[PDB]
């Protein structure tokens, strides 16, 4: 029959494999493209200089142990085989805390080709270090990239590359982020290159320009219109002493509760900003 | 401890490989890195890391590491390389220990 | 970045002898300074090294008893005193520093700037 | 047949091996030389004394029982094999809660040399215990610790040694600077020997210098402050029928030195003592009573 | 060599779902404490962190070998073959030993069967503090713990002379309170299984008003002298 | 469960039933029916379902794992689990607070592509995804009804 | 001994004993008799509309199979051997996030008595549901 057919087949590839080795060991390097689809980008956190990513990650590459002739179709094997076969050691050179999702099994892919290709997927949360400059807050750029690179093998065993090169991260135009707004991503493949090697590395960066309309309605406007309204003792006369007095020090006290409500309201970033720069001007105006 | 050839030789526009052999706790652990020495003068550096080549030396040079050998490959070879080439790797056997090769007399025929 | 060193000595053997390396380009204590001695005859052999920030040495097996590598931050010079000097000590003494990369996969040494100036005896 | 022998290498091994007993049991003391490379200083909580710190720490030793022979000369291993050997069981005396990551493989290696000597690799993120002294806040300046050695392992039996001099063995990454507040200086490596009631232990010290940021606190605190009384002492050039408005200015800067005092203690952590914002603060308010 | 031997054979035969003398007499285990730390007392949960290094001692007659090796110091390796008491924190909220780099266990076994485990824990304790002369207060607040399925005829803790000892006591992440003192002590606990020997090690805390002094008390007091100001404004 | 609008995310707890047809697994006995021990039901072969918008979710295993797997002798397969989900709710807020909204729970098949695995729903479609009457743990929204295809 | 005495009667009590099935697999249900010693409720969320307790759960039945008469004590056994014995599949039906504290090991107890009587308890910690009407707050 077909079903069995298979059975002894995939069995026969298994058996007498040995793991530890990388396809080829002997031979030139093993070439792995990578995929992305970026199911989401959660959380940009100003305090913990973070993001967090939701995506799915994607591996292919030769595995001419893992050829088979005796079928035609795409094997699409169970997830508790990756565990069997040789796995790139690919790891993400700035994340923090990173998870392959496990409801209800597992979430990663193992598919077989009659070529021998190998086709590897996970679907990944992982929470990368983006460095940040606020200098320019509210009125700045973000560039958060994430880093892949692979951890023993150097350029000599492995190759890493972007699997169409320009197409490989898909699902970014479609992110919808609550404070920010994805103006570009590039794709970098690279080879670093260390004491004891040179080890492959691919990168994804995103730019993130910060959506300004809400710090404009929420910060800005009450301080004008509060210095304005400062102003607004000069056209009272000058016998109106008690008036223009209430007037001028109300102000400044209107200005003390929006300094140091934004203080709180504000992510806690322990540096000067543009903002403070400009509530720090208004109050000197007052 | 390392040895390579007391000397080499090679036609010019031919490439040359001088090598190096040391043990397991010298080259197979530590990176070589290569010193010409011009005839008369001070040597000077010509390849580090096995690979990497420091600012000046063309790309002419070229180094290699396999296991617990190296060598360095000197193509296009011309007149202005005959020299010495010696070879050195930090041993990890004592906490500061770098371990000189014989050294290769490389001769340009014609 | 130079390591301009002593002039050349002349000595009977049993004498001390002294050599100077006075180093300019480079913050002398960032880097270390490993003394490679060439004996006219044959290949290069390494002295010793020392860090010019702790004072820590590494003289080479076969000189462990016959040398001292001290350094001088203030002027900037690493002068080797070699002692006990015997017929087979007739060398061009090489003033190296030892420029150093670490980073994730281990560290990789070498010397970049070298020097010149011997001794006889 | 070219991985045949490979294999065979592989496979053989580990025959006759015990990962309980540390190599060299009755015959040396075992010699791990450490070294760190700190990928990025990660944030310094200043509420909770502590900081993360994200690191490549290598550990080498010398297994004589692991001598092989064959056409490779460097052999590496597998986490299932790296699980079967003994390595050493390095912990961070002050470490509160270290995560070694294994995405999308545990970021681990091993790897043998033909004569016995193991090299082993983990990248892992330790967080920290930075016992802080804030009497000059925010003026003040750390120089908080990282301390590592040898769990169940005397000064008798495992005796960590820095692989070069102490301080080319603790190297931190030109943008690994994560702190926003503060400004990290230096660093001193150092070794020493803990005391205690189980026995002797080496223990390999590493304290990073801290230097805190000033200009936040300035125009977000000192300056609002010093305007405040100020203001309050320019109600002095007002004529003195104007009660009223000379009132206004005297309770409204009250108010307004309570609350940018309120806001300045919220930002500072909860201490039990004074300090030296605290102190300006309190001259402050005491000058606009 | 020898010491594969000795341990192969120490737990060849071995069972290790049966404490020591199962139907003979309780097992004896003299227990010992290490506070590296007591981190924060936060009153709104009512917990207080707290680092120790938790030893027990107890008595192994199937460990036992002869040999010139007075002493076996293993690794956490072996912890999971031989028996080990099932000690617990009886007033933990969320209690969690580390694994990092390496399990941070310790297993001594000696001549005459005695063995020592030593492991490394974080402990979430809580205690109801009663925040009456708030700030002015000054609480104890326990860390007891005894065996879990093992009853008093079955397993007994006994202090030693040096058990519980402290460290530095000033890098402490103590924030507003300060340590003044601790005590050990020894109770048996009627449960729904049976009679539990609990230990006991009380901590000592007490608040410091720095803080709150200038917080409240100062700007209070100078807001109401303020408003007596009225008074001496004309009417 | 709640619906946290600062994170834009909701919660839901569910029993998840799935009913497929493997024909290894038939037998001849006295029972018609037999549930199968964890132990083995981790041996055979089981849909890889996953939740696509899910950000973290829990297979609960207090006090045993919360699964029962049940074979009938024709050999097919019930599997029921029980699981919360942590799932992502995008959420436009340009009428707030007088917006409403469509939180979506997507599933489906890791790893088999339409021609392989294909899920329908065991009755009519808004038959086969019912809320308990009481079931609803929202302080801010209202759940007015589920919409499924 | 009496230590020998033990390791045989507990080696033949798990020995040719199927995990699969229940005390009286053909007979009548088993009964199973619940304790639970509250040790604390922590916290009670009107947000989130659940309160974490913290309890000592316990479980009592009669397994025949688990019968010994060559000695008289209330056997204890370490708590792994919980993972041989068939346990019933109790669940809470309004929990969010539990676990059995595992400190410093597996918080948990299984002991034999001598008539078949099973004992099993654990220490968990729930974060259980509970649907709360705020509109009387704080008067409710
Ligand atoms: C509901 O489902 C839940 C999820 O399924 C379930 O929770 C799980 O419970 C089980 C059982 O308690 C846990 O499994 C145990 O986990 C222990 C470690 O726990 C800590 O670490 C894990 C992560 O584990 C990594 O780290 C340890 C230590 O290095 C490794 O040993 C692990 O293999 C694993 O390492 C891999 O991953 C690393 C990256 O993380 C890699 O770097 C590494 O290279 C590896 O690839 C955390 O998840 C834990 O946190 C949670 O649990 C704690 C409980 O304390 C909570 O407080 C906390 O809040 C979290 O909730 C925790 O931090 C393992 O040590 C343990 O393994 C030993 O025990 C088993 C069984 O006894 C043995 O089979 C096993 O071999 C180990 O024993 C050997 O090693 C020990 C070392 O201590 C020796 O002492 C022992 O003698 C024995 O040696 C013998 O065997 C050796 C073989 O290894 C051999 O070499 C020796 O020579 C000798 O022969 C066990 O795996 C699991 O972690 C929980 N999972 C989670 C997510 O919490 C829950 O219980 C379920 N509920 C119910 C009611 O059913
Ligand atoms: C976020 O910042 C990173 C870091 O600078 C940006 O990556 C940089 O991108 C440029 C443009 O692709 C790279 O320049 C290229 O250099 C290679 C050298 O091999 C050359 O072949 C190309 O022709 C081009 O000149 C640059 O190397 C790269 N830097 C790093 C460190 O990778 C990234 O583009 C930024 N994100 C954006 C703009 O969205
Ligand atoms: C195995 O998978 C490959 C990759 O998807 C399939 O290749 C496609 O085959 C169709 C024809 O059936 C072509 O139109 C596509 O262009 C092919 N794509 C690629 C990337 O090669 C293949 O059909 C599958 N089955 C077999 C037997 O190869
Ligand atoms: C960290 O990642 C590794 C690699 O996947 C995990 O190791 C697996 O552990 C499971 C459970 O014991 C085994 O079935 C697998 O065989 C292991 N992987 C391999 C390649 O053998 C490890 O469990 C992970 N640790 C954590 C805490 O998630
Ligand atoms: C700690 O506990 C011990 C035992 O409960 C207390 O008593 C001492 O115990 C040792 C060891 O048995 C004896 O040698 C001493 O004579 C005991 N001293 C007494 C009874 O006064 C010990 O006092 C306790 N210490 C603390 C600080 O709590
Ligand atoms: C063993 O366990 C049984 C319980 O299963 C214990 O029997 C209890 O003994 C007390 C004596 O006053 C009675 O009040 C209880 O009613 C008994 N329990 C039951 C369920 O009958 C017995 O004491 C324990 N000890 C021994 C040595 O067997």
Redesign the interface.
Known sequence: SN?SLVKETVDRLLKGY????RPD??GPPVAVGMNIDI??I??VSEV??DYTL?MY?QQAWRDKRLSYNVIPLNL?L??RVADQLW???????????????????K?????LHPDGTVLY??????TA?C??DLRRYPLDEQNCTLEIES??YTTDDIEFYWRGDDNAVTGVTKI?L?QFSIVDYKLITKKV???????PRLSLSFKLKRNIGYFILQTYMPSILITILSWVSFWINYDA??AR??LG??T??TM??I??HL??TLP?????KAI??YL?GC??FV | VLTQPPSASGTPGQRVTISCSGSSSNIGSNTVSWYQQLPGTAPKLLIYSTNQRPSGVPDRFSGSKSGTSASLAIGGLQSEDEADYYCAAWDDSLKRLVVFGGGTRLTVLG | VQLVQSGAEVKKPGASVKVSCKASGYTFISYDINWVRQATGQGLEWMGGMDPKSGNTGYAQKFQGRVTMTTNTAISTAYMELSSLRSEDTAVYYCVRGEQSYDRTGYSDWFDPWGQGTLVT | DNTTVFTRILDRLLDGYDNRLRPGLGERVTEVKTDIFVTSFGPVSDHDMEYTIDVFFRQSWKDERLKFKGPMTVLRLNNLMASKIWTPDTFFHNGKKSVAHNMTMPNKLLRITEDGTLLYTMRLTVRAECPMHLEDFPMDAHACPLKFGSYAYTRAEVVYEWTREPARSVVVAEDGSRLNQYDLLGQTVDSGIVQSSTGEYVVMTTHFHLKRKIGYFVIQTYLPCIMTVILSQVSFWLNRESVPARTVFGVTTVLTMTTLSISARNSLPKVAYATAMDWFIAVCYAFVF | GDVTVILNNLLEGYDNKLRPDIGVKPTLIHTDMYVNSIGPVNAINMEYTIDIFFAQTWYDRRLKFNSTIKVLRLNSNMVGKIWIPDTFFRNSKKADAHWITTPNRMLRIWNDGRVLYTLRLTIDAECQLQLHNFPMDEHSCPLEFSSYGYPREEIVYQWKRSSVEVGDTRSWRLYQFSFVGLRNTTEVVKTTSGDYVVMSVYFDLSRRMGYFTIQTYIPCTLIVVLSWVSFWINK
């Open positions: 079903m040995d793991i530890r080795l060991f002997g199911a989401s959660d959380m913990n200089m939701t990650f699409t169970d997830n796995v790139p050691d690919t790891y993400f050179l700035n994340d923090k805390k990173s998870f392959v999702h496990g409801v209800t099994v979430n990663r892919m193992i598919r997927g996970l679907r990944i949360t992982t270090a460095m940040m951890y023993g919808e609550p290159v260390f004491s004891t090697g040179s080890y002493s008690a007095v209430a020090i109300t400044v006290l003390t509760t300094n140091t203080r709180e806690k970033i322990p540096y000067v403070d720069m720090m109050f000197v």
